Design a protein around this ligand. Sequence first.
Ligand SMILES: [Cl-]
Length: 105
Amino acid sequence: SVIEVTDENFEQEVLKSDKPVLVDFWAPWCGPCRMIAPIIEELAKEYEGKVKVVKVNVDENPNTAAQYGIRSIPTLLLFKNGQVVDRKVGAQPKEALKERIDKHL
Ligand SMILES: [Cl-]
C-alpha cells in the first residue's frame, strides 16, 4: 500500500493528491533507509484513507531530489496539497513519526 514514485509521476501522485502525503526519499545502498522501510510500510496501513504514503528513489530520480533539496537519505517530507509542511531526515522510530505527522493533519 506504499506507492513507489518517480520523477515521471511525482506531480500527479504527490502534488495533486487529495490526501496529505508522506514521502520517503531513499536509495538502494541505504542501511538506515532499509531500517525504516517496514516502518514506512506499517504507516501506510495505519494511515490508510487519511494519509498517502510514497517512496522516491533519489538515485534514479535526481530531478525531484533537486527540486526539494534532498541533501541526505532517508529524508521524509510531509505534503499537504502541493506544498511541504514538515521535514525529517534520518531513520526515525515509528511512533515519533506518527507524532510528527499528526501535527499537520
Ligand atoms: Cl528502502
